[PDB]
Symmetry: C2
Amino acid sequence: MKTRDKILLSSLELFNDKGERNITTNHIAAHLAISPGNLYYHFRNKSDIIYEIFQEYEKLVDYYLDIPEDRPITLEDMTFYLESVFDGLWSYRFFHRDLEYLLDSDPRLRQDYREFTNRCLAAINRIFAKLADAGIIQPQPEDLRSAMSLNVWLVITNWMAFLKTAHLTELKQGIYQVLTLEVPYLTPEYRERVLALREKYRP
Amino acid sequence: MKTRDKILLSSLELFNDKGERNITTNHIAAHLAISPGNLYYHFRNKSDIIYEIFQEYEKLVDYYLDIPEDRPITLEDMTFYLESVFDGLWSYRFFHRDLEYLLDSDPRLRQDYREFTNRCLAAINRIFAKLADAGIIQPQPEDLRSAMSLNVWLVITNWMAFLKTAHLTELKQGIYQVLTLEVPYLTPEYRERVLALREKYRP
């Protein structure tokens, strides 16, 4: 692994574990046993570290939420989209925790995150659109589906934060809450299985 | 106004405007034109300021969410509960922004916030329970209602945070998203008005 990749890997670990608030470039250099100057060669400041870490998260989520258009959406796809996004949110937990300071610190990050959020929302719309086509949920108007998609986002991205105030694999039980959003829209064909599936995620 | 009350009022203003992360007791003393020693008399450290500010927010929300039991719940009550909680979340915006560091800094705050969250959730259950009794929504099982109540909480407390990433009275349009949760459970009697009401909050 190249020195640079260690820097990104270790920074992520320290940010997730101690909070980005409390981690400086000197801490990161000390952890990695490289001089401050060595770290500076690869990254001029902490914001540049954070931006590149975000760019890896962005690439990951885009890859998971690249919806296939040549086949119908299955329940196994639904569980994959949900689990993989929840795993992402755990692996990059430092980001959503200090989100608002990170956006304010970096206009590039703010711009990219706004655009990323629209892609994610557009993938949630698209998943529901396909679930309708497959006969899993009842098809809904353009407005009520945009609203419902935002609620999915709001629930998923605030689950970690709720767990810290209520008290790894403890984390995925937020799927139960997301599936609760689509409980009354389930068609007769699938009501039995989707509820059965939902139950397997209960805290 | 007593010197102490100014300290709490001004600390809230500086925390909301600049972020608690970036505000120290010296900044607060400087803003108020009182010596560091004068501030120390009233508050030994920043955590004590924050705890007391939280205790005022807690009292406020408890007062708004003290559900009357001697009459049925109306739609006007529903809008009040929603608007007042959203106004609270704006007025104390600094708290939810740095929530996780604030809980970690103070075990008293962590304990009280966990308990406060249960009271709030228990008021959401109770509001739905009363909406069922009034014939506004369809009555739901104990489990599906606990789940739905948590989704309300998850949506409300993450609305501010979404607005910073998507781009005062701009803030209350999250009511549309909360009411979207109860759209399919509306009874024939009230479907017309609750949707009509929901529309008045559209961004």
